[PDB]
Copies of this chain bind each other. A is one copy, B any other.
Amino acid sequence: TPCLVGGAHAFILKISSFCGLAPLRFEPRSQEYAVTISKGKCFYSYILVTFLVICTIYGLVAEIGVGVEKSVRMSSRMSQVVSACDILVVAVTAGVGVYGAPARMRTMLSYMENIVAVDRELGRHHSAATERKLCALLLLILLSFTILLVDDFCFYAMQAGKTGRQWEIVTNYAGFYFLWYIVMVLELQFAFTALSLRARLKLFNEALNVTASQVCAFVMMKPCLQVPPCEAVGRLSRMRCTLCEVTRHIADGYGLPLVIILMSTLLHLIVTPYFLIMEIIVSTHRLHFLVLQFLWCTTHLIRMLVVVEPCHYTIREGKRTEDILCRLMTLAPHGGVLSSRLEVLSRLLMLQNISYSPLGMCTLDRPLMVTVLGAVTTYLVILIQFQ
């Protein structure tokens, strides 16, 4: 029983397995999947990302070498720099995601066996309807992004068909669009890992609340409590320490990809609206281009949202536990042994909090999204008014 992953979190692992983002071996168990590191998939991931980055660099160099008048996507001087910056930031995100995948997956195996212990202690997990909805949402995001990628690729390939270099665009941007797909899969993988962790934290909060109600190794019954509240509070304190450790492991594993993703999102939310506005004020003459630019703006916003939303939900659960603990304290006999257990839990809550701080650069939550959007508007207002 190496890891025994399952649910919607295990669905993106299979999807990420073919993108180089989860070099694991999946052994069916008719209930879950026993995942372990495979060296063959690690080597495949390494060679795939290396080939994709090499092809992306070669296409970026070739499109520069085609020229300004001959090339369709990058037909200016700032256009060449903006296109190169977009291509390179996407390539760097994909390379960070795939080259760091096997170590990330070992860390995943560790905190996932920890989560298996916690889930055995708490008792079961969410219903199959919730995981089906989560799988549907992940598949919807992936398919929407893939459809956008295919549409944009076909549009730019058909635009160069007038010049006759239709296959040149394919050769120069196939790796770029593959790296886009890889980046999206990496974002979704992190988001669903964080969402499964937040589900565990929600179960912990429910168990603590049931300890509060005191209706009166399978700590929970379904709710109902199968142990005295004093024992339950200590077991839940240990479980919360385990959950904090798992959250820290996830943050350590995804900190560099998360920071690169945030930087890429800032860059794209600056550049895409800029040229979308530039195409509008000067002369449209292209409905498909404007549609694609709006869709890409929404795509970058959705990328930022799927990065920062599970962290916000985790922090919200970490505040709900404090509210529950305060209501716990106001109840129970004053000088009883339950009160001292709740005091230990209070010290735990004050000392450590379950949050995400990728690389220590910032905190992943809603205020970060406000700061990024405030900076994007500041840059856009400065840049647009110059033209």
> How many residues on chain A are close to B (CB under 8 Å)?
50
Measured CB to CB, the closest approach of chain B to A171, in angstroms, equals 29
With A241-B327, A329-B348, A382-B382 as given contacts, are A337 and B340 in contact (CB-CB < 8 Å)? no
- A383 CB contacts on chain B under 8 angstroms: 381, 385
Q: Is A286 an interface residue (CB 8 A)?
A: no
Docked complex Cα distance between A50 and B340 (Å): 55
Task: Please tell me if the beta carbons of B352 and A351 are within 8 angstroms of each other in the complex.
Answer: no
- A245 CB contacts on chain B under 8 angstroms: 323, 327
Q: Which of A324-340 contact B (CB under 8 A)?
A: 325-327, 329-330, 334-335, 337, 339-340
- A366 CB contacts on chain B under 8 angstroms: 359-362
Q: Is A322 an interface residue (CB 8 A)?
A: yes
Q: Is A350 an interface residue (CB 8 A)?
A: yes
- A340 CB contacts on chain B under 8 angstroms: 334-335
| Chain B residue with Cβ nearest A332 | B344
Docked complex Cα distance between A382 and B386 (Å): 10
Q: Which of A85-93, A158-166, A188-196, A372-380 makes up part of the contact surface? A: A372-380
Q: Is A256 an interface residue (CB 8 A)?
A: no
| Chain B residue with Cβ nearest A320 | B248
Partner of A334, one of B241, B341, B369: B341
Q: Is A343 an interface residue (CB 8 A)?
A: yes
Q: Is A365 an interface residue (CB 8 A)?
A: yes
Docked complex Cα distance between A367 and B360 (Å): 7
Docked complex Cα distance between A365 and B343 (Å): 31
Most chain-B CB neighbours within 10 Å: which of A248, A326, A359?
A326
With A340-B335, A375-B374 as given contacts, are A351 and B330 in contact (CB-CB < 8 Å)? no
| Chain B residue with Cβ nearest A325 | B351
Docked complex Cα distance between A361 and B366 (Å): 5
Task: Please tell me if the beta carbons of B326 and A352 are within 8 angstroms of each other in the complex.
Answer: yes
Task: Please tell me if the beta carbons of A337 and B334 are within 8 angstroms of each other in the complex.
Answer: yes
Docked complex Cα distance between A386 and B386 (Å): 8
Measured CB to CB, the closest approach of chain B to A42, in angstroms, equals 28
Q: Which of A205-243 contact B (CB under 8 A)?
A: 234, 237-238, 241
Partner of A237, one of B330, B344, B369, B381: B330
Docked complex Cα distance between A344 and B339 (Å): 9
Q: Is A55 an interface residue (CB 8 A)?
A: no
Docked complex Cα distance between A341 and B271 (Å): 56
Most chain-B CB neighbours within 10 Å: which of A337, A339, A381?
A381
Most chain-B CB neighbours within 10 Å: which of A316, A343, A360?
A360
Measured CB to CB, the closest approach of chain B to A191, in angstroms, equals 17
Give 20 A-B contacts (CB < 8 Å), ordered by A residue: A234-B330, A241-B327, A245-B323, A312-B360, A315-B360, A326-B351, A326-B352, A330-B344, A330-B348, A334-B337, A334-B341, A335-B340, A346-B351, A349-B351, A350-B350, A359-B366, A375-B378, A378-B378, A378-B379, A385-B386
Binding site for B on A (CB under 8 A): 234, 237-238, 241, 244-245, 248, 312, 315-316, 322-323, 325-327, 329-330, 334-335, 337, 339-341, 343-344, 346-352, 359-362, 365-367, 369-370, 374-375, 378-379, 381-383, 385-386
Listed from nearest, the 5 A-B pairs whose CB atoms lie closest are A360-B366, A238-B330, A322-B351, A361-B366, A237-B330
